[model samples]
Target: MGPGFDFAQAIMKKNTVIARTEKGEFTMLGVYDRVAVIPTHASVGEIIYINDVETRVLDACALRDLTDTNLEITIVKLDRNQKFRDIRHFLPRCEDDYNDAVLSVHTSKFPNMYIPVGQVTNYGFLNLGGTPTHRILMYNFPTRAGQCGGVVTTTGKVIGIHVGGNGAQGFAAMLLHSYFTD
Candidate 1:
């Protein structure tokens, strides 16, 4: 097997769910085999469902233009939550860096796309809430619809949450550890 083959295998073993605000309104999200994360924009007060089961948005935050990175994430408390089934146990610990070979599982129409992580091109600042903050930049990573809340893994470890992307690059919240640790 290759270096990240086992990691990729392990990642696929866990479940991926469809996050929705209502019937027919949803996006694909990776369950860290334990917790489900959604984008802040999609995490509305309306009922959010995961894998056909109801869930609660327990926490939400936007790391507005921070020094290292910019991110917006939401934590979902699953119904009948299972503690042992979390995928984190099989993955590597989270780290904040840009030089690792990463993989991301994204979705569009129906199927999921496993794509490689690209180079860290630059740092970007956003004007959201009129705050001047910067974020890590990764280029050459293609993204599709329903992929805004996807997960990015590297060396078999959870790294970041896919947030926004275009034809040229993609963006993820590198500070993912804060959601679970804090």
Candidate 2:
């Protein structure tokens, strides 16, 4: 089973990563080597575990806001000596249109159990903070708490990041800041 015995019955392997934060819990998408993205907003102090190693966040760069949330995937140096292990980056599909069916890949019942399938019902913006800075992609699913930061995807491509829940909808951060032109 070495040469002429290669297992070749596969479609596509889309890489995705889910990380849980401590003290409380959250998930992150591994976006690069030593860099991932989470779905919630926080103030500085951060730490995560790759099984046992404790890797902390170092000044997360904001990607606008899904009302409020940010995911950081990174490594650190100088007073920070840890990094995420086996980083598998998400293949991003920055264009998710309204009514596009997608799923929220994240923890639901347990630390990791179910992934919710839904659709982009409405697309609009709210005057968040002092300005209408954050854009919102409303999804038709009531994701639970600790389910914040769940990456919204369709066909294994990232469309947005789950931030908050309003009654029967979830606010996702549509990555219009993508095209990565910055």
Candidate 3:
């Protein structure tokens, strides 16, 4: 069974793009030009592997593309009330252990909030909010200063981008495939 949670409300201000460094420092990158905050997952359904030992075509493709590269990811942690705090040096080596660590931190921090992506919700998308018309979802807390942008995934494939959360009912963004595709 997975954690039962709903998509919370979030507000993404204009001119801000979540970013993270290789050392795990989370920051908001100002979008000077036209920015495309894309979600790299499907709107519904989870990407699963039938067998552990089997060589998946997607994995092979990813391996070929990412033979030698370091990924940047935004990292955030929630306070007691579920508010997000941007964590520093949240960058990992884009490996299984690093992915595990990111998941662990998310679950441990917000034990009560809704996790619409990853192991929680089957469907996923980046929660982008706005002022004139809000469209992003919200979490309980906002991520730290340096945990906003970066490539995050479970099986080494890009899944979501860590935006930010408000701890009460606000979240930044988690890039998903659905954002990019139809």
Candidate 4:
């Protein structure tokens, strides 16, 4: 139903990078599937640090909905001139596969870690500023404060981006096809 463990593991070990700014550092899920996906709240002008080198954000678009829950997704384009190692290809899951377990990649005080597969508790729209946006709910998902931009996948393929969460439940920006397909 979703991208399985093999895909999830490769993504975490390879393309996962960090978004750095003067203020702080956050996780940036970089997939060689040929796109850079991140949380919208983070600054687009921030530097991307990968494998000890830095790259510039060529362009970025943060999609939002005025009356609905904000998608919280920011697609970015990095400078192509720079060579990047450890980039991995990622596949996106279909919308109907909501029954699958959810997997998220985040960073701890030590290093990058993966939140064990959690169940998709629910799916619906969130209201933000009088607008509605699609959101996915996961139960028993582990996440930290600075891990907002982390990647969430089902079976190894991408499904959403971590936004925020309470103690046991959390939300993510569902990666609908409309946003990825040209």
Q: Could you list the CA RMSD of all candidates, in the order they appear?
A: 4.4, 7.8, 18.0, 4.3
TM-scores, all candidates, are: 0.68, 0.60, 0.26, 0.72
Which wins on lDDT, candidate 3 or candidate 4?
A: 4
- What local distance difference test score does each model get? 0.53, 0.46, 0.26, 0.61
The deviation in Å at residue 43 for candidate 3 is 26
- Model 1 ranges with Cα > 4 A deviation: 22-34, 56-70, 87-95, 106-108, 121-137
lDDT of 3 by residue, 111-160 (tens): 22223332322222333333111223333333443334322333323234
Model 2: ten consecutive residues of lowest lDDT: 3-12
**Model 4: how far is 17 from its true place, Å?**
1.4
Q: To one decimal, what is the Cα RMSD in angstroms of model 1 from the true structure?
A: 4.4
Candidates sorted by lDDT, descending order? 4, 1, 2, 3
Highest TM-score against the true fold, candidate: 4
Q: Model 3: residues >4 Å from true position, as ranges? A: 1-129, 132-142, 168-182
**The 10-residue segment with the lowest total lDDT in model 1:** 126-135
Please give, for residues 35-101, the per-residue lDDT of candidate 4 as tens digits.
Answer: 6777765666745654446776677788865554467788887774543342332444445445455
Scored against the true structure, residue 167 in model 1 reaches a CA lDDT of 61
- By TM-score, the better pick of 2 and 3 is 2
